[PDB]
């Protein structure tokens, strides 16, 4: 899109207008819930079902804190990329930004490069962003 989605309720699912295109920046601005309450996810997916998630970005406040990055294809999860030293904390606001590049998603958190996730499926087929889990959202916006 862009009008942004303002104060969207979680779980959230919404259209990305024109789908993912090279150069598109998707901001997810919100706060990790203080409750107990150990994971949240941002999914760049095709349609409503969640069977085809080009990029599942999944902070887990477990086993020291880590982020799982993965792709689901016709209902099947791939091999996980896991990143430690995660820049999310329970009760802490965040500005999470996804940049679509030709080769990857570049993910910035609070203005700092966090992870790159190389495309496993074509990114243009992504037409929907969904967010679920232990998070509240101030806005999701698009540049
Ligand atoms: O890979 C993303 C999905 O992970 C699923 O859980 C994994 C788990 O991370 C891994 O340790 C292994 O044991 O298998 C599971 C795959 O079913 C979550 O259930 C799912 O929500 C995604 O996060």
- How many residues does the structure list for the chain? 143
User: Do 54 and 71 touch, CB atoms closer than 8 A?
Assistant: yes
**Which residues span the domain enclosing 10?**
1-143
Rounded to an integer, what distance in angstroms lies between the CA atom of residue 119 and that of residue 43?
14
Backbone angles phi, psi at 123, to 5 degrees: -75, -20
Cβ of 77 less than 6 Å from ligand 1: yes
Task: Fill in the DSSP letter of residue 115.
Answer: E
Structurally, the chain folds into a number of domains equal to: 1
User: Do 72 and 51 touch, CB atoms closer than 8 A?
Assistant: yes
Chain breaks in the chain (C to N over 2.5 A) after: none
**Would you say 78 is a known binding-site residue?**
yes
Resolution rounded to one decimal, in angstroms: 2.0
Strands 53-60 and 135-142: unpaired
Measured over the CA atoms of residue 110, residue 61, residue 37 and residue 74, the dihedral's sign is: positive
CATH of the domain at 127: 2.60.120.200
Atom of ligand 1 nearest to the CA of 56: 2
Region label for 83, one of left (φ > 0), alpha (ψ between -120 and 50) or beta (otherwise) = beta
């Amino acid at each position: 899109s862009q009008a942004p989605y303002l104060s969207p309720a979680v779980p959230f699912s919404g259209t990305i207008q024109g789908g993912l295109q090279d150069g598109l920046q998707i901001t997810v601005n919100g706060t990790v819930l203080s409750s107990s309450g150990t994971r949240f996810a941002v999914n760049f997916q095709t349609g409503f079902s969640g069977n085809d998630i080009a990029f599942h970005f999944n902070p887990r406040f477990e086993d020291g804190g880590y982020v799982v990055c993965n792709t689901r294809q016709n209902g099947s999860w791939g091999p996980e990329e896991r990143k430690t030293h995660m820049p999310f904390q329970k009760g802490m606001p965040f500005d999470l930004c996804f940049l679509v590049q030709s080769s990857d998603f570049k993910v910035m958190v609070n203005g700092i490069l966090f992870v790159q996730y190389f495309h496993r499926v074509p990114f243009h087929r992504v037409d929907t962003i969904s967010v679920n889990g232990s998070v509240q959202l101030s806005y999701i916006s698009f540049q």
